[PDB]
Amino acid sequence: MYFFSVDPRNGASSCCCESISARPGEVNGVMVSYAAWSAPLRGHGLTNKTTFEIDGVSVTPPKVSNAFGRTKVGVVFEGTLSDLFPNPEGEQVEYEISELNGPSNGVVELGANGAFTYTPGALFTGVDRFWFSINGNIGEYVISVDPTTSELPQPPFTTPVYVPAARRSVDPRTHVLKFVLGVSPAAIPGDVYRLTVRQVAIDCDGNEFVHISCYDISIGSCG
Amino acid sequence: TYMKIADYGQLGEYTCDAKCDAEFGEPGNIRHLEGKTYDYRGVFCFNRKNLQ
């Protein structure tokens, strides 16, 4: 669990944005203590109006593309995994399905040449993924099983680094913010993304004291 | 003349630790009122013989 003490903005307190190290696949929790900056500002403490943003300063675009799959409830799905790796050179295609990032409500049987059978779990409807690895380059294949009525929508292909929608909290009694930092198994080791957090306090009457700080999430292998 | 309690109003509620915002709250009114009365005032007349 990461912990950070934010600068108090008092005129007295490598890069400037602090560093954060993550490993592909992990989902951690981060803490920051606004006690140094918000306690002198005597008021109603913090508010649940935090705003995050993700941008990468070095991406190294991925090799294999992603794809989408569609099928109704209960009916077995079939698909190909050879079009997802347009390779510049000529080399074999070592398709592999990691038992760690496989499906969650189904099973997949990897064929001999870029073929796989996704038999979704019976009495189940929703969306399901599984992370393949075409010769080292990891990508995700998303499948949504429709509840036989019309159709299901199209999920947004979760990013390398992400902060969940609603899993954060703040304790105005002690001025501590908590959130979750998730990194998909498709992140390439070596890249660095930048996370910016805009935290806003509130006075005794209902005005605002905003605060902005940055962090450099560095996706490195082996912790 | 009578009175009409318009409302009672709120009183500062359930503060666990001192934030000092809702000290006095707000009370209501008493709204003194009034009201008059009316009258009919009709008449009629017969002469002396058409009634006799």
User: Beta A51-58 vs A192-202: how paired, if at all?
Assistant: antiparallel
Task: For residue A76, count CB atoms less than 10 angstroms from its CB and return exposed for 0-12, middle for 13-18, buried for 19 or more.
Answer: exposed
Residue in A with minimal Cα distance to B21:
A204
In a 3-state reduction of DSSP, which class is residue A141? strand
Closest CA to A35 of A179, A171, A203: A171
The region that residue A46 occupies, defined by phi over 0 for left and psi between -120 and 50 for alpha, beta otherwise, is beta
Angle at A53 between CA A50 and CA A56, to 5 degrees: 155
In contact, A133 and A98? CB cutoff 8 Å: yes
Residue burial A165-199, b: 16+ Cβ < 10 Å; e: rest: eeebebebeebbbebebbbbbbbbeebbbbbebeb
Q: Which residues of B touch A202 (CB under 8 A)?
A: none
Separation between Cα atoms, residue A185 and residue A25, nearest integer Å: 4
- Cβ distance of A44 and B20 shorter than 8 Å: no
DSSP-derived secondary structure for B5-30: ----EE-----SS---S-SS-EE---
Angle at A172 between CA A26 and CA A51, to 5 degrees: 50
- Cβ distance of B20 and A204 shorter than 8 Å: yes
* Distance (Å) from the alpha carbon of B25 to chain A's nearest alpha carbon: 15
Q: What is each CA distance from A15 to A19, A66, A137, A190, A201, in whole angstroms? A: 9, 34, 30, 17, 26
Closest CA to A142 of A159, A133, A154, A151: A154
* Distance (Å) from the alpha carbon of B37 to chain A's nearest alpha carbon: 52
Q: What is each CA distance from A19 to A5, A162, B52, in whole angstroms? A: 13, 16, 121
- Elucidation technique: cryo-EM
Listed resolution, Å: 4.5
Q: Which one of B16, B19, B23 would you mutate to disrupt binding with A, by most A Cβ within 10 Å of its Cβ?
A: B19
Residue B12: which residues within 8 A CB-CB, separation 6 or more? B22, B23, B24, B25
Separation between Cα atoms, residue A25 and residue A161, nearest integer Å: 10
Residue in B with minimal Cα distance to A44:
B19
In a 3-state reduction of DSSP, which class is residue A179? strand
Residue in B with minimal Cα distance to A206:
B21
Separation between Cα atoms, residue A16 and residue A184, nearest integer Å: 26
Q: CB atoms < 10 A from the CB of A34, how many?
A: 24
Which residues, listed in sequence order, are joined to residue A2 by a DSSP beta bridge? A30
Residue in A with minimal Cα distance to B17:
A173
In contact, A198 and A177? CB cutoff 8 Å: no
The two tokens of residue A159 are 């990013």
DSSP-derived secondary structure for A23-89: -TT-EEEEEEETHHHHSSS-SS-B-S--EEEEEEEE----SS--EEEEEESSS-EEEESSTT---SS
Q: Which positions 7-26 of B are in contact with A (Cβ < 8 Å)?
A: 17, 19-21
* Distance (Å) from the alpha carbon of A43 to chain B's nearest alpha carbon: 7
Phi, psi (deg, nearest 5) at residue A206: 125, 15
**DSSP annotation of A13:** -
